[PDB]
Structures are given as structure tokens and as C-alpha cells.
Amino acid sequence: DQPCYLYVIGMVLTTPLPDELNFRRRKLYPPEDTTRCFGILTAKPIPQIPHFPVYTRSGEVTISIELAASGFMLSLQMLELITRLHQYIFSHILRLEKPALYCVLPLNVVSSTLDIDFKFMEDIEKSEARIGIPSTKYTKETPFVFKLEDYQDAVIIPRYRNFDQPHRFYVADVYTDLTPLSKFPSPEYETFAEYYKTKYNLDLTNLNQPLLDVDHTSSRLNLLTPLSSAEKRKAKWESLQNKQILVPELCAIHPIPASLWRKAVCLPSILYRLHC
RNA sequence: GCGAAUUCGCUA
RNA sequence: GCGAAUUCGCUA
């Protein structure tokens, strides 16, 4: 077997988005606030490259590619696991056929010290929300239980539509003053519970849970720099998507945390820069 | 983003 | 095929 090189893709939010530019009124998420990040595993050294910006939703992020380890070996089993996850990142999370517009892999702390997050990779592979919508069995006697902690750093998908390609959302807010019995913003339905019952024939087992504000996960491919009728229509679609209020019981939590998802969307730009 | 309708520009 | 304008449907 040939020896490996491991690089960390360092990310720091060096210029937070100014208020005048925060049109979608998002929270800002510095990548450096969470330890799990991405790295690159290669058989060749990567030539030294200067720091460069990607322009994300939260502002300008400085990217630095730094050597974490070299000269070590990995077993075939681990290389295959890493390979599957690289493919997973581009085919299932970003849904992209051309990663650069050798293997990206997750790194995490073992104690302020970055290494390949094998456990995280294994958890992904075991997740029932790994690809699509996981089965659930909420009944009156075994109802849905809302745990706030599970929604703090979550990406969620609706369990009740778009089965072939689910819409993924960041949880942007937890509305504790709302429940499924809150008033529905349309004269056609009295409550959120009635909407989901009438539209989808969905029953709820928990009428006390808070509701959720969401932010679509969609990102443009090239973030290396900071109009039309069609772009207008798309912008209007994204606005309505972001006005949606969802019911936790009716959604599934994706195994990839929001904090890591926010970093993943930078990957195509970074690989493009490295290759071109 | 996935669709529809109507109208206009680019070829000889 | 490469573009543009106007209008409508799908999410809560």
C-alpha cells in the first residue's frame, strides 16, 4: 500500500455579512464554532496554495489548506469507507455530478486535535435517514416526543411529500409560542393540525410540540465571488420556502448536522480552486 | 427548484 | 439549441 497525505480544509469567518447585505435575515454561523470539518486525503502532496475567500451565507470565509498528517497507511476497509463517504457527499448531500465544477472526508477532534472522523462516517452509514425518509411509528400510546436538543444543529426533511428527492431544510428557529393548534395563515384552514389532516390525512400524536422556522439548503455552485424573470421566479420560490412553518413530528432529522452541511456547500468551490 | 401559457431576439 | 419579456400552477 502507498502512504497517505491528510490535509485539513481550514475555515474561518473573517468578514461576517453586514446588516445591509443580510437580506434573508439569517443568523450568521462561523465555521470555526464547530470542531467537525472536512479534510482531503491524497496519495500526492498538495502544492502550497495561498489562503483564499469563499463567500457564504454568513459572510466571507477564509480557506486554508493545511497538512494534518503524512506518511501513514490506511487499510483497504477504511479506504473503501472513506471513498463511499466522498461519493455520498457529492451525490446525496450536494446532489452534484461534478465535484470540482482524491477523497474529501470528515475530520473531528479526538482535545483540540483533528483526525479522520471514522465514527461519524459509520453513524452516517447506519442512519435510516441516510438517503430518504425513515419509517416512524407514532401512536397515541407511543407518541412523538419533542427534544429541543435534537433541533439545535439540524437539517430536516418533510416525511410526507417529495419522496424521490426530499427538500432539505436548515432549522432556523424553534417557535415555542406555537403548537400545531396555532392559527394557520390561510382562511382555508383553522390550525396547522387541520391543514396536515385535510391535505395529507396526517394525524398528530403530540399537540404541544413547538413549530419550526426553516431555511432552504440550496446553494449556488461557485462561491468564489460574492435580474432575469427566471431568477425572480426562483427567488420568489425560495422566499416562500423560507416562510414555511413545519411540524417537527412530520419531519425527519438528517444524519448530517447543519454546521457540517454549511461547510459542505463550500466544497465544490474549494476543489475547483485546487484543480484550476 | 418542478411545470404551464403567450409573445419577442440569434441561423439562411 | 442559446437568450429575453409577460402571466399562471406546486410548498405553509
The amount of beta strand, in percent, is 25-35%
* Widest beta sheet: strand line-up: 3-4-1-2-5-6
Structurally, the number of domains stands at 2
Number of DSSP helical runs: 6
Q: Which structural class fits the helix and strand makeup?
A: alpha+beta
| Mass-distribution shape | globular
Quaternary: monomer
Report how far apart the termini are: 29 Å
**Overall strand count:** 11
The radius of gyration is 21 Å
What is the percent of helical residues?
Answer: 10-25%
* SSE pattern: EEEEHEEHEEHEHEEHH
PDB class: hydrolase/rna
Keywords: PAZ domain, platform domain, connector helix, siRNA, RNase III domain, endoribonuclease, pre-miRNA, HYDROLASE-RNA complex
Assembly: trimeric
Entry title: Structure of human Dicer Platform-PAZ-Connector Helix cassette in complex with 12-mer siRNA having UA-3' ends (2.1 Angstrom resolution)
Structure description:
This is Endoribonuclease Dicer. Residues 119-255 form the PAZ domain. The modification Phosphoserine is found at residue 229. Belongs to the helicase family. Dicer subfamily. The protein is of the alpha+beta class. It folds into 2 domains: 1-131 and 217-226 and 254-276, no CATH class; 132-216 and 227-253, paz domain, CATH 2.170.260.10. 24% of the residues lie in helices and 25% in strands. It contains 6 helices and 11 strands. The chain has a 6-stranded antiparallel sheet with strand order 3-4-1-2-5-6. It has a 5-stranded antiparallel sheet with strand order 10-9-8-7-11. The longest helix has 18 residues, at 76-93. The structure holds a RNA duplex (12 and 12 nucleotides).
